[PDB]
Ligand binder design. Structure first.
Ligand SMILES: [Mg+2]
Lengths: 121, 65, 181, 54, 458
RNA sequence: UUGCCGUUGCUAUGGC
């Protein structure tokens, strides 16, 4: 019913943000709504993360429209300041994207989180 | 650096001594000869070197302790 | 004289080694898991057969039998600990549903491959046998080493390994010395 | 809108900046059952502060 | 015979106690209690938070990032003060850093009076290294954000580092740079500094996932410590070499035995599902953001879920936890959550209380070997807590609402006789968090040093 | 007591 949906819980958000920090270290993270849009256009995004406290929320609702069209999992986190923190950027992030790479060193947990996100959807 | 940890310490006044198992962490080193172990234990327990005996030392597979 | 030290055979020859379907099966198992020979497959099969025969015998016993409860619970705990049996499947019936592949994946070789430390199962084998892999703080050189759930997260390059932060191996420093000279 | 100069060196920076603001403005309108002009006003005001800066 | 010498020193020391007055016997245990790594300053109950004289002093420089305070101390072993010189007898100094690349020192001797500026030094683009090589990053001044400051216990040097991957040590009297020690790492940005109490040893936490140990008197590097899987954000030290650190998102607090070259692991591992079941809002910890050692055998940490955790060396898990210590953030405004004209539609987007999140513990400082410690946030008040006698739990002693903004670093200074001691709390206040500017601008936040003098009566 | 701009006393705090 709410526009931000599904919204990850306190437990689930941690593992998602865990993958986010690991991805940032390995240059496998795309930060910001504009970048996430580009990845969805290219079909190189494993899944998309959004912040449910975006002010206003609407300016990132185009990712959900893109996502299930391309059959890409997505999920919302309560906080953007927290999301920006894990991203490694000194500013809040309302949306980010995990780039697809089957040769990545952190593949396994990416699929683990992705499986849960699919279940939540 | 090398560290010596004493475990399972028992006080045997029957034989007038203290027994224990010595674990020696020696990163980046082949092993510690009984002489250095004796002088370090003597310093730690504040006794004469001749009063310290050490034996039965085995380095685990892979080295380091 | 001194008392005997017991010994046992860890593998048994099959009832019919010459089945073509079987031969293809060991071809699969060796190829995918990079096993040196058939004896490894036979060993794993023998262990699995012992386990499942014990499970069957336990099942034959009536429910609530103290022997059944105790021994079945012990077997399930061990199988969960080694990781073949998943947490949500703690019943003796699913033990009978185990397969050789489950044990094979838990081998340190396969785990090293999956974790990304090696680019091939054979690369994993050569890395292990060359003393580059350490579980926790200890170095393991045995591809048949079985990894536990807790041990799985601690697999890493050994401190003494050149890949693990030690000095370069003999070839590297030899090449550097000749280049400097 | 770069063929009809809808958004139009320092001038070019404004155009790219304005284009971004127009993009999110479209997002608010499209995914809103009853869009309001409250955000567009401040968003345009944000452009104005960016305009005077250059 | 040196024992006679100890007897003379003990005899003179005994005469002092008689002037200070059972009472003599207790005070004898207290003075040596620093040797025994246990809490021995039980003054929380007698403390008077409500009557604290709070003051906020504005400062020009932006985003005051850290503060280091120097206190001369009488040494029982030699019965001499720690002052560097006879002029500095009983003179209290505070050093501050900011994101403006400026060092400033203040005189804090007079508790009743606000901090008084003495000297400053400023960095800028002039000090950028031309070489572009790590080992030649040896310019006299800073060029990037200065994050930390620490004062030597001897009162002879003050040392600062930041994102320039440099650690500059300056003379306390003139703030003259005497040595530059590059970290010699591409990502080795200094995040925290801690001086070993009553020693010249300095422990530096760097962003390259390592801890570096230096000797200031020799102006040389000693060792590097490894084991953290993420940035080492904070470090605390006591008289003993068991310095503690927290690795941020690795969610693991680490105690380093330097001479033993070993390291003890500490992890929270709390989960809301069990907490709710045992109850039958709780926010799961993401990262540990501050650490300070109450004791040689105990320490405390703050998280980014607002959880203050008490620890003991014996046990790996936390011994006591205080969830959402500083409260929950204000709810996002409905007028700004969505662009819908209808207000009820906007309220639905708030999604009840699910979007609510807790404050972060930006600062957490404990007076050494005491039963009281201070925590800070941008909630707008400093909270003072008291640990139980058994060291198994702690309670909120009180609050000080004077501070308004992010509390980058909290310091405490004491003066007066042993029986009658006045405690003055100095906390650097900024408009943005030290490590970066994630935080939304807090209404009213100002750049300044917050001061609160607390009197001790019972 | 502040880099700048105000208010408030003869000192204290509002904004960037
Ligand atoms: Mg070797």
């Amino acid at each position: 019913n709410p526009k931000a949906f599904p919204l990850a819980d306190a437990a689930l958000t941690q593992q998602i943000l865990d993958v986010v920090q690991q991805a940032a270290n390995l240059r496998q993270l795309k930060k910001g709504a504009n970048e996430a849009t580009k990845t969805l256009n290219r079909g190189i995004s494993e899944f998309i993360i959004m912040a449910a406290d975006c002010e206003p929320i609407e300016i990132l609702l185009h990712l959900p429209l893109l996502c299930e069209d391309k059959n890409v999992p997505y999920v919302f986190v309560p906080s953007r300041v927290a999301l920006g923190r894990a991203c490694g950027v000194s500013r809040p992030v309302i949306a980010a994207s995990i780039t697809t790479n089957d040769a990545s060193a952190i593949k396994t947990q990416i699929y683990a989180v992705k499986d849960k996100i699919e279940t939540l959807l | 650096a090398v560290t010596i940890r004493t475990r399972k310490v028992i006080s045997n006044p029957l034989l007038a001594r203290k027994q224990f198992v010595v674990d020696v962490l020696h990163p980046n080193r082949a092993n510690v000869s009984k002489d250095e172990l004796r002088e370090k234990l003597a310093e730690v327990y504040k006794a004469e070197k001749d009063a310290v005996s050490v034996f039965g030392f085995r380095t685990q597979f892979g080295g380091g302790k | 004289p001194r008392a005997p030290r017991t010994y046992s055979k860890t593998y048994s020859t099959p009832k019919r080694p010459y089945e073509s379907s079987r031969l293809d099966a060991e071809l699969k198992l060796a190829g995918e898991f990079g096993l040196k020979n058939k004896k490894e497959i036979y060993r794993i099969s023998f262990q699995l057969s012992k386990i499942r025969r014990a499970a069957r015998d336990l099942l034959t016993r009536d429910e609530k039998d103290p022997k059944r409860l105790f021994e079945g619970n012990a077997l399930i705990r061990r199988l969960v600990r080694v990781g073949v049996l998943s947490e949500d499947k703690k019943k003796l019936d699913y033990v009978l549903a185990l397969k050789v592949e489950d044990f094979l994946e838990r081998r340190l070789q396969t785990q090293v491959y999956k974790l990304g430390l090696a680019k091939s199962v054979h690369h994993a084998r050569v890395l292990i046998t060359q003393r580059h892999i350490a579980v926790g703080k200890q170095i393991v050189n045995i591809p048949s080493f079985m990894v536990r759930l807790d041990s799985e997260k601690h697999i890493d390059f050994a401190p003494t390994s050149p890949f693990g932060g030690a000095r370069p191996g003999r070839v590297a420093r030899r090449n550097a010395a000749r280049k400097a000279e | 809108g770069a063929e009809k100069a809808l958004f139009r060196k320092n001038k070019g920076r404004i155009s790219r900046y304005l284009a971004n603001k127009c993009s999110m403005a479209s997002r608010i309108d499209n995914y809103s059952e009853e869009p309001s002009n409250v955000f567009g006003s401040v968003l345009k005001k944000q452009v104005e502060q960016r305009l005077e800066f250059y | 015979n040196p024992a006679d010498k100890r007897r003379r020193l003990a005899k003179q020391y005994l005469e002092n106690l008689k002037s200070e007055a059972d009472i003599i016997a207790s005070r004898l245990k207290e003075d040596v209690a620093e040797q025994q790594g246990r809490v021995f300053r039980y003054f929380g109950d007698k403390l008077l938070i409500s009557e604290a004289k709070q003051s906020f002093t504005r400062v020009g420089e932006n985003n005051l990032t850290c503060i280091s305070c120097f206190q001369p101390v009488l040494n029982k072993y030699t019965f001499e003060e720690s002052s560097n010189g006879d002029k500095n007898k009983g003179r209290l100094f505070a050093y501050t850093v900011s994101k403006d690349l400026q060092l400033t020192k203040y005189d804090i001797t007079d508790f009743s009076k606000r901090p008084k500026k003495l000297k400053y030094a400023k960095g800028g683009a002039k000090y950028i290294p031309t070489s572009k090589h790590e080992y030649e990053n040896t310019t006299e001044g800073h060029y990037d954000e200065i994050l930390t400051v620490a004062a030597s216990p001897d009162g002879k040097y003050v040392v600062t580092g930041g994102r320039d991957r440099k650690l500059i040590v300056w003379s306390t009297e003139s703030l003259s740079p005497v040595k530059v020690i590059p970290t010699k790492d591409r990502r080795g940005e200094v995040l925290s500094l801690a001086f070993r109490k009553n020693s010249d040893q300095l422990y530096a936490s760097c962003a390259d996932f390592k801890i570096r140990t230096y000797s200031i008197n020799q102006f040389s590097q000693l060792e590097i410590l490894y084991g953290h899987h993420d940035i080492v954000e904070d470090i605390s030290a006591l008289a003993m070499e068991r310095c503690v650190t927290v690795g941020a998102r690795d969610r693991t607090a680490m105690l380093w035995k330097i001479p033993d070259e070993t390291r003890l692991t500490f992890r929270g591992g709390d989960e809301p599902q069990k907490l709710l079941r045992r109850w039958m809002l709780f926010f799961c910890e993401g990262s540990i953001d501050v650490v300070s050692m109450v004791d040689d055998f105990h320490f405390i940490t703050g998280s980014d879920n607002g959880n203050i955790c008490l620890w003991s060396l014996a046990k790996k898990k936390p011994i006591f936890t205080e969830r959402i210590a500083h409260g929950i953030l204000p709810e996002p405004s409905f007028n700004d959550i969505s662009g819908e004209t209808d207000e009820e539609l906007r309220k639905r987007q708030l999604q009840g209380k699910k979007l609510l999140q807790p404050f972060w513990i930006t600062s957490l400082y404990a007076i050494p070997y005491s039963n009281v410690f201070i925590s800070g946030s941008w909630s707008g008040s400093l909270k003072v807590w008291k640990i139980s006698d058994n060291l198994r739990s702690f309670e909120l002693l009180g609050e000080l609402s004077g501070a308004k903004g992010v509390v980058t670093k909290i310091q405490v200074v004491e003066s007066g006789k042993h029986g009658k001691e006045k405690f003055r709390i100095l906390a650097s206040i900024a408009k943005e968090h030290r490590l970066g500017r994630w935080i939304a601008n807090v209404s009213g936040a100002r750049n300044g040093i917050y001061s609160a003098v607390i009197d001790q009566t019972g």
